[PDB]
Design a protein around this ligand. Structure first.
Ligand SMILES: [Ca+2]
Ligand SMILES: [Ca+2]
Ligand SMILES: [Ca+2]
Lengths: 437, 437, 437
């Protein structure tokens, strides 16, 4: 029997050194990560190779660029396989993502989710260890249009970028609501501005009894509703690569970045659940989600775990030394601002954004044990990111103390209850999933 | 008195050599262009410096990339000042636009509308001749988000790109229609998916009695309607650069690319009219529009001409040798396709798109005469692009014959009548604007 | 509680290897430096990246250029954060300072005080350690005009250089002395040579009842005097960066290079005292001065220490292997000179300059202990640089023996008495400041 352990974690938004402090609880986290066969995280920052140019990314909270020396903080902490597909990997454009891959390869760090072309971004990376091998696939459902990689044609090269999981939303409305929408379209003169497109394309492209108005899809249904669905091409392409990786490694882990919420902020979008189920149907041993910056529930599906969101494992956005002009413009200034003052005014001196809420400063590191591909243990290690501490101290991870760990483990159990997930709890505040195996 | 002549033209979508054929009407066009002090066109193609990667641009009709030798076709034909801000300048990304500027500078071709940063894209270019100087400013209202250039910050460099003229549209709806829109928002569960944004930002960002639903702005009014307005920052920045250029050149020409229609396809958007009036208020001597691929009206405002659209002066999209994989994917294929077959199937063997309509194959070259900044003549030269000819022959310009020129001059007069523009007509089918000077 | 130790030191003018000798007192110094969380020094030499060209710097004692391998001597000795703003950082011009930053970054050495532009030179550097973080800011009040860095404009790049603290001197003279100065100006014909400047600028620029003659500022006062004041822009910009750094690190240290004397050589200029007080008012935890090559007093201000001058920690000017032609020209030669003979004749075989005076060969290394930003200890370690030894042996640091340390500690106490500073003295000749905490 082959026995392999895998640590999982969420967003690694690292911008400073000294990631692991002298706190014994922080050193114990590093010992935990180093003790596993593979430790996975999501690199939610662009290590600067000097190459590239800042992109306009206000919806993502601004640019997230750091000195490349943060990569040594990541590996020294114990992380050894990096997922890179997310809404910040392209913060320095195509040249930036080329520089990131150069930096990662020169340091010997296995990574997936970005590439010089679409195939390269979709490929798994194979991390080989003496005890066995892990294949990591990384994709993101949250990114700016055009940032996805592209494969070459016979005449033109590809385009560097990220591995995409696109998705569409459809608004279910009643026939009465539907008629008003088409009435607004005609009476406002909006339909009159598509008159040329009717001659060009042959018919009004707004008639799909489906309907495209305002860039949104409307569908007549009995009761109002809201549905989301994966892009069939991305879903079937990513699923195909999972089947490929299953033949070439002991363990297949799919990492998926997704900000989009379900009916509630605690809930993943329905398309993300269909995606996660598809990955395990294709042979993946675990699905690790991230994006929201807080924890979501844990689902066991066909005896494999789905972590819909592990939050942040490092959170140092407000310590960024590199703020672009477009980010500075989101804040009205009388005189030029410095990065720290810009982030302090962006939040209203910490009264808004993520600072005042505890859910944004708790994290979780699951440690999974597999024996011949069968999950035999899933230990849960709550992580404290320092809620309420000064801005320069919070965001660095440590194993939470007993009292904080119990509160976090309670939250995870409550978030996981709709999936039927049960948890055993240890005296130290750690826990593990009840497995049907 | 200083006397200066300026030829204007629309989109130059050149992908092949032999731009000026041996046809005497084509050679006469080159003689006309060469005979002026300045000849302006809009470079609607990316000259390939080998650098860059194709971007996803399906809304613009695909990528538009050509051998850099087409630049010698452009200058040999008589064009001497290039506007470069449009929806295709970024078809090879930021590296492509850096390569384009390298190619243009190495050939000594003055250009505006793109730059290594936003200031560089906004700057006028000064074309100095023995008789005097012309300042060209170039901006585009049609481009993919993020393609605009960016200026540096203290910490981060800028971003190469185009000079933008952004604009917003607002839907005027009745209070009854407004209430249904907010009812759809709440009943579909759409408002429930913004619950986290209410805690983060402080309030529902959909409440501006203005309203943002579906990514569109809705405003309660007495009668349904549709309005557009320039981005105040772009308008005031571009206007500022026009005032700067007026102090440094005899003539200031503003070239603006705009696909967006008004109430009718023949009509420019209201924001474009406000922009054009603003440019002349600031000191511009002419405003030349392009984008739609057909002609629009001509307006005289404060004794200066506004050409809302001069159509295409060269139209060789279907002869492109460089089709990207994402463009190929817009066409369903059984076996791999070649560019010519791809463009033939993209249009349904020429039954759709621009091929079957005459308005897409007529053009116009105005020749303006200024004396000490006063417009003293505005001659109109209709151009034939070869409607109905084989795909490899159509798209090259020549002075239209008498019968075709008269039809085109009639169209221009009809399109210009709502502005009060009158035209004198010559025996050869050319004409000129009736000037109040 | 976070507990952090910081070693401070003065000018590091290192040009040779073997910085730490086999002497046990030298090895004990390295053990002391290595034992702290952060050890700061001022790099008073240009590590040669092969780039640059020697500048004319006779006022600073000539060029100070060394093999880049001296950087390994600096870090192996225990120094871990480098201040680089001083009157020698630009000895190889802008290319030299670019090469220095390349050399420092490739070796992983944190540094501040120089940059590719003014912002980069003003920024703090953040040194992160397991126990906490230190922010270092570095500026110089002594440099050749034009050597300060410059920030970019929209049209032009910045200029690499140093972080400046400019300052002006004003001569207070009586009205009788004032009238003679204006009489000399008119009667010598000096005022007649500004006749064109009166037409150009509008008025005589020598009339500010202030007065600018001979490039000096004169002001009428009741009694003759002499005052100095910081450049308000540099003071307010540096103060702003201190407030920024206070939000992002546990400790903020400001290092300021200043040759200028006060009323006495032992005294700092009044502008330097105002600067140091301003830094602590803004949140700095320590101010470390250097420049004079001898010790100055120590001030406690708002329970934070100000070391107006720690002298030299390494002094190997006369061992430089790289003497420029302009430096050689300061010495009259019959035949070409070698560096050692040039430095021996520059001093008159050691009868002039710094060789014969003991104050130039004593140094001091304070070791500060902070607990949550509160200074809880400030130990003083006298350093011996080998006064009276051969030129090739003197300049390397070691902990002074008991007798020499007591003499140095006495000097420091006497220099610090005007500030109210008291010292406790240990049996070994070390000491510490009496803290009001
Ligand atoms: Ca994210
Ligand atoms: Ca276009
Ligand atoms: Ca000095």
């Amino acid at each position: 029997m082959t026995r392999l352990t895998v640590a999982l974690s969420g967003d690694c938004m690292v911008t400073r050194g000294g990631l692991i402090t002298s706190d014994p609880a922080a050193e114990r986290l590093r010992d935990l990560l180093r003790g596993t066969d593979f430790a996975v995280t999501n690199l939610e920052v662009v290590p600067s190779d000097g190459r590239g140019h800042p992109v306009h990314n206000a919806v993502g909270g601004g640019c997230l660029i750091a000195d490349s020396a943060v990569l040594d903080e990541v590996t020294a902490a114990g992380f050894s396989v990096l997922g890179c597909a997310n809404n910040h990997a392209m913060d320095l454009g195509t040249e930036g993502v080329l520089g990131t891959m150069d930096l990662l390869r020169a340091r010997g760090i296995p990574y997936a989710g970005i590439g010089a072309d679409l195939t390269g971004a979709r490929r798994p990376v194979y991390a080989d260890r003496p005890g066995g091998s892990l294949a990591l696939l990384s994709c993101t459902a949250t990114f700016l249009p055009g940032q996805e990689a592209a494969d070459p044609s016979p005449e033109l090269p590809g385009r560097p970028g990220l591995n995409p999981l696109r998705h569409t939303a459809t608004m279910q409305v009643t026939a009465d609501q539907m008629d008003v929408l088409r009435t607004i379209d005609a009476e406002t003169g909006l339909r009159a501005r598509r008159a040329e497109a009717r001659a060009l394309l042959g018919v009004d492209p707004a008639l799909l009894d489906r309907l495209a108005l305002f860039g949104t899809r409307f569908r007549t249904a009995d009761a109002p509703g809201f549905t989301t669905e994966c892009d069939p091409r991305d879903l079937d392409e990513i699923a195909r690569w999972v089947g490929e990786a299953r033949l070439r490694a002991d363990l297949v882990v799919v990492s998926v970045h997704s900000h989009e919420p379900g009916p509630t902020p605690e809930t993943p979008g329905e398309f993300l659940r269909v995606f996660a189920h598809r990955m395990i149907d294709e042979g993946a041993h675990a699905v690790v989600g991230h994006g929201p910056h807080f924890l979501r529930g844990v689902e066991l599906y066909r005896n494999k775990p789905i972590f819909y969101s592990l939050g942040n494992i490092v959170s140092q956005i407000e310590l960024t030394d590199r703020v672009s002009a477009e980010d500075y413009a989101k804040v009205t200034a009388e005189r030029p601002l410095t990065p720290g003052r810009y982030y302090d005014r962006l939040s209203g001196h910490g009264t808004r954004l993520f600072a005042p809420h505890r859910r944004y400063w708790q994290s979780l590191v699951p440690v999974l044990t597999f024996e011949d591909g069968t999950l035999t243990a899933a230990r849960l290690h709550p992580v404290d990111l320092g809620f309420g501490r000064p801005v320069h101290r919070r965001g660095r991870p440590r194993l939470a103390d007993r009292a904080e760990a119990e509160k976090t483990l309670t939250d995870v159990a409550q978030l996981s209850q709709p999936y039927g997930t049960a948890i055993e709890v240890m005296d130290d505040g750690t826990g593990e999933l009840a497995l049907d195996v």
